[PDB]
Amino acid sequence: GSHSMRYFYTAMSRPGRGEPRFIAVGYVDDTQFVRFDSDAASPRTEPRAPWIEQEGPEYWDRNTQIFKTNTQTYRESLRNLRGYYNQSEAGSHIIQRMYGCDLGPDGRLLRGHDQSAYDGKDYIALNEDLSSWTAADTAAQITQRKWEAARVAEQLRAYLEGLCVEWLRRYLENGKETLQRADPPKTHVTHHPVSDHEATLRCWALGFYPAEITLTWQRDGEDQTQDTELVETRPAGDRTFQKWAAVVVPSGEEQRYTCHVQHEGLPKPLTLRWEP
Template sequence: MWPELLLLLLSGALTLTEIWAGLTKIPGHASSPRPVPHTLRYCSTAMYGPNVWQYRYTVVGYVDDTEIMGLDSDAQNPRLEPRVTWMQQPWVEQEDPDFWKEQTQVFKHYEDVRKEKLDLRGSAFISDLELYTWQENTGCVLGSDGRFLRGYSQFAYEGTDYNALNENLSSWTTADTAPWIDRNRLLRVPDADSVRTFLESKCVRWLRLFLENGKETLLRADPPKTHVTHHPISDHEVTLKCWALGFYPADITLTWQRDRKNVTQDMELVETRPAGDGTFQKWAAVVMPPGEEQRYTCHVQHQGLPEPLTLRWDPPPQTTITIVGITVALGLLGAVVTGAVLWRRKCSGRGRKSYAQAAYSNRAQGSDVSPTAPKA
């Protein structure tokens, strides 16, 4: 597969303002609901190309930051399937015996439409070496009281926004971008009234059911595991990196301060990334001259924390460095002394052995010669 395809499958959605949900956990206390919105969104991606014009279509359903179901046209039997254990329970079929079948048919219909839109081999601007994508992001948002707050639906081609449903859900607005695209063919969108009906009724109903049956997963708040690392760059610069690992939901704030003043403009901040186990990770870094590390503090805010955290880089204790240095020095000295003693013994042994052999030889020769008396 193509690298671009892999990136799109990992992203699975258009860029959109995220809406977070969860509980606040306080160590030693029971968790209590936090009054925040919840969202159910469906993200689909259609891809076409290159060379052999291979086609692929994927759909992923999310509740807040959790992937709960998905469909992949490359599967042996493409159909919408649960991606979490609590979606595999009988309650889904009890609520709607044909849920999985009907949803699969709906998305397969959309797949056929997208495939037709992307079948542009006859267009002059299509290249056999390029990969073309068509994305959709549609969802509904509920308030903490379970009431409908808003809905949205967005379309994009090649990562560029083209159509978006207006806030009143009554009409579409087309972005004035990439005029060379065959709009009459590519940018046809569903009827706004039908989308609004889905968002205000079926989407809301299922989001409430998902939150109720998956609350142990969806309404949790896992606090981040945090630490600061030190990375020398040169003799004149070092980097401090503030880490947050294993947290859920994904909404988190990492901020570096120098003498209690934000240094956001000088800070390198990566996007929040999935860790692969249902949690997320993130880091923020700042560069400074050596010796100024203690002037910097990292501030972490997350709904799983009872209060914001303030972190500093803790250099290794001087006593530890001294002990390690002395230990290494003594070890080296011991090795040198041991080697010298062994070498001396070896050399001394050779000398004594040669001397003894020579003395023995002389004695032996002397014993074989009898004293001769002088002749008269």
């Protein structure tokens, strides 16, 4: 029932290889729905999910206007930050920005976000109050002063409490058949001997949405945190996600081990064991 929208901007300079690339992508939860890329042959905002396609040409043009303006603005910001850090014109640098709104299960604004980073390090973030900034260092303090002068926090607050929430709600309704459908994981446990003395139990979760899941192994009902190999949740490429967790167990203590699976799509949490 809990939903979010985010935009992710990446601006990357590349001295000697033309002007900085700007790319923006938009997500509702784990579903990407829009992209814009200053490097594309003809840069325009493009749909990346079926439910956004129904938006009319005035939506597409509005987005495209915004991201074109951002392309130019970020090129200036890259120049400025290079200066703030006394950096040479030789190196590539990246500004990243992620912002957006969280809704609770009732559809109300839980909180808003707007954070920027420079070469992968926190640089400036809007505080949870949506009215003040946290600047990481003396360079970011310069941006902070600029943004206070432009009344940025007040404008973001209005967006995050207003348009962000309204459009998220619209998208959730238009895409309700996928965005508000939780697909439970399909699960199974595999067993492969590693030697005479030990075997790997691997607990699989496939085909689930959204990406959030808990996979644990227990021995005698106690968590095996330090002994579980736990792979990053990965996209299947069809909107769904995959994950596995593995423990190496003594032969044949296999029945002492249980895999536990929590996910929104399940009627009830699962307890699985290896089934010879």
